[PDB]
């Protein structure tokens, strides 16, 4: 009968926080999905928005796996004990303020789930925020230092309901969210960095 | 035993990253907010900036010692202890802990952590300037531990969350009610227990 | 013996996380604020932003060394020492410590810690612009140690008040009075000793 | 049979973050190049600008080298494991806010690439920002403590589009960027500190009108 | 023969960051000199200024010394590896924001040079800032915990241009800077703390 302590100790002994856990020469498949919680500050003049979102991050490290028939199937682990993908929002203009305890969930099969609530300010299109059509703010998120052969990022294919966890008390409302995959290259070099482009279509609530 | 020995033993047997479940039962965390001040309120953005003592209580029996011929209680830095990963679900700033980050550990293994916190929330501020006042609901629960691992309960002390509130604030508290809740997410089957603190307050005067 | 030996010995025998109670008696902490500046005052919100030296004095006999043929006093980083967990009960910001975080330790084990602090409080600012001025009450005591473990006493040596106060502030100090108190909470039986500092101040250069 | 694990372990064992990796007694050649991403806040009165830029930093540390015949030729490494040039913007008036994960890329030969996205406020000439000619804000960046014999700084010859990665959503636009080398000495002492002077010619966007 | 690595290793082994490096029982001679780079914000009413300056700090630690006939005569060292004087600006109302890499320069003889660029806000006389004569803002800087017998502070009097490194783009200009030695004592106690008093004579540009 394994206990939570044994599970953590095993993770510590095999997990290498600064070493990407590539199997063979294949990329690590990171799933990335934003659930928007609040839109706090919007500036149509500067084209800047301040947003709060849960950044659901999923990937696999099979070296962490254990046998969970007669033991817990999942444990909470501080991210300092784990390798974590070096995700960056490419159009952010502030560092991400992580609001929640920095713990990830590891499952007996080796799936890791890290989902911090983040508050961050972005440069994006705020034109039309006070119209019926609303504004569309595009947020690009991907690895900062790992190219397509080392990390691939994919939008999760979950749920669908956009305003599901969104504050009813915000001054804004969400019309639609669409998450699509992209791939930026830099003229310096031949490698491609995969990203997810989250399109946030929102507008001021108005009237009453 | 000397207080040094007690602390050394706590260090050596405490596991800050390991939830101290007895058997297969959840850890019973008691959570109670005592509001001290309301600093900033915005009826338009529905945001409040509040200061509150977050009284947090739970058991870790591995910490226990024999306190017949020794002190029954010590102050311990939380970095030496497992601490529940509580989050305010509708907070829009990180909690600014104002006070020394020490908890109190009793010889039986009861822990009491009560930081003074300043934090900004998204909640209903409509009616803050009326007789009825506004009702701001703050939900607080574990971020990563579900109902089988952590349960949160509003302390059986159902006394005044007032009585500690600044007389010098521009606002007044009408009522505070602390209730248990249990949220689930459509992705998954697990439930996260929370306490929902309903703060009914209003601006002082006309 | 030299300053290096003194520090090494302090490290070996000092226990920063162990309150140095002699017998079962409380540690007698002396607490005294010298106000240096009043920066910002708000009659509407009842908030003040102040800078003050928080003179803190206590005894830790475990620190003691000889000092016939060695220095009688050293500057020691507070991380090497037990330090009382003082908190201002009506503060609304964390104390911003402006000065190097060193205490002074004497060979007998007397400790003097005196950081310059900038901190914001919730207190009575009514009447700040009158002849009588406002009286802002600041309560400071241990956060986790009750009356049997820590006692706090005002050292009121003496009543000079404006002695170190900035001549360049827009406010002036009329009087400071430091008195002892003892708060209890209805949940629980323990009493927490505090010092209540009454700051009587007013805007300079009034009409009457 | 760990591979990237072995690489990192070996870097830890032989890397000295506090030791400048001079080959012989020659200076370390640090290449420094800004790509401007955003201009956030501009004040013609105070002569202050708030800018976001990628600071492409390149140098050689042969102590990091490994043999990559039967292993990966490149890894991402946290900068705390590496010596990193002590670059400062001389006319900055805020600390650099690093926005991106603090990882550098190390190649098996010991070439290092560190490229943080930085947000920082500067004191520079903002006069004329609202004219056709725009303002020219000069940002000076060099080692803080290493003189010309220990660190040399060279502007890369990217020589490309200036507005290439610049936000279309900024209120400002870039007219031209020119990166040139300089070399300042102080009256106290005989040593010279090499820097790069980045001249940002920008202006408020026109009209939107018709 | 010996290399930068050896030099640093030796510094680590023999340096004691928390131990003042007094030779015999004589004070450590700290030289302190401000070069003003910018004046960012001034408030005539509150008597507050926000300034940026290089704080050139010089002292001797002979325990650090090495050979250097067949090796480098100087190295850059992180200050966390060194003892550093606990200097404080006595009339500061913000903590010093250090803008530059926190490295000092150590010479083979044991001379240390630490020169951080600092941005800090002070309480000083801003009266007359908008006149031809300008204001004179006095900044006092000295040890916080080490008295005259342990640390002495002396102005480097390098007879130079004051506005040499000062921003041409500031709204203010410097008329004169004068650095003189002083010595504060407190009524509680007999010990004297040596300081340097930096007198910044400056004024708003233009408007005439
Ligand atoms: C793959 C594997 O071995 N899984 C095991 C199973 O065989 C065993 O019944 C149980 C008790 O050890 O733990 C699990
Ligand atoms: C040039 C060099 O040093 N590279 C070596 C290579 O010669 C050798 O075949 C291989 C296996 O040990 O390791 C690597
Ligand atoms: C510890 O406590 C138990 C429980 O009452 C008691 O029986 C035992 O004698 C104690 N042991 C000592 C003296 O440490
Ligand atoms: C300390 O100093 C006293 C001074 O007289 C001396 O008697 C003693 O032997 C010294 N050594 C100890 C025990 O600290
Ligand atoms: C430094 O080392 C060299 C070794 O070649 C020696 O000749 C020299 O005298 C040394 N310096 C001193 C003064 O010890
Ligand atoms: C709060 N939301 C949640 N799932 N969801 O929204 O789909 N799971 C809890 C996460 C488990 C690990 O970090 C938090
Ligand atoms: C964003 N630009 C990029 N390359 N470039 O511009 O030439 N690479 C990402 C960097 C690779 C190493 O650190 C981050
Ligand atoms: C100051 N308040 C106090 N009790 N109370 O408020 O009910 N006790 C100290 C707290 C309990 C242990 O951590 C801090
Ligand atoms: C800026 N001034 C400078 N020299 N000077 O002023 O004479 N050197 C850089 C310093 C070298 C040691 O720490 C920083
Ligand atoms: C500045 N004021 C002072 N005494 N006083 O004001 O009564 N002592 C310096 C202290 C020595 C230990 O920490 C600072």
Residue numbers in the entry:
A (entry chain E), E (entry chain B): 0 to 207
B (entry chain D): 1 to 206
C (entry chain C): 1 to 208
D (entry chain A): 0 to 209
What text comes from the article?
Neonicotinoids bind to the orthosteric sites (normally occupied by the neurotransmitter ACh) of nAChRs at α/non-α or α/α subunit interfaces formed by seven loops (A, B, C, D, E, F and G) in the long N-terminal, extracellular domain. Of particular importance are the basic residues in loops D and G, which contribute to the selective actions of neonicotinoids on insect nAChRs. In an attempt to clarify the divergent mechanism of dinotefuran's interactions with the An. gambiae nAChRs tested, we cocrystallized it with the Lymnaea stagnalis AChBP (Ls-AChBP), which is not a nAChR but has been widely used as a surrogate for LBD in nAChR interactions, since no insect nAChR has been crystallized to date.
In this experiment, we employed the Ls-AChBP Q55R mutant as it mimics insect nAChRs in possessing the basic residue in loop D. Dinotefuran bound to all five orthosteric sites of the protein as observed for imidacloprid, thiacloprid, clothianidin and the nitromethylene analogue of imidacloprid. Of the dinotefuran stereoisomers, only the S-isomer cocrystallized with the Ls-AChBP, in line with the finding that the S-isomer was more potent than the R-isomer in binding to the housefly (Musca domestica nAChRs). In the Q55R mutant of Ls-AChBP, the guanidine moiety of dinotefuran stacked with Tyr185 in loop C as in other neonicotinoids. The nitro group interacted electrostatically with the Arg55 in loop D and Lys34 in loop G, confirming that these basic residues in loop D and loop G generally play an important role in the selective insect nAChR−neonicotinoid interactions. The non-aromatic tetrahydrofuran ring is a unique structure of dinotefuran not seen in other neonicotinoids. The tetrahydrofuran ring oxygen formed a hydrogen bond via water with the indole ring NH of Trp143 in loop B and the main chain carbonyl of Met114 in loop E as in the cases of the pyridine/thiazole nitrogen in the other neonicotinoids. Nevertheless, the tetrahydrofuran ring hydrogens undergo CH-N electrostatic interactions, which are not seen in the crystal structures of the Q55R mutant of Ls-AChBP in complex with imidacloprid, thiacloprid and clothianidin. As such, the structural information supports the unique experimental binding interactions of dinotefuran with the An. gambiae nAChRs, with the caveat that the AChBP is only a surrogate, albeit useful model of the nAChR LBD. The protein was cocrystallized with 1 mM dinotefuran in precipitant solution composed of 16.5–18.0% PEG4000 and 0.2 M sodium citrate (pH 5.4) at 20°C. X-ray diffraction data were obtained at SPring-8 BL26B1 beamline at 100 K using a CCD detector RAYONIX MX225HE.
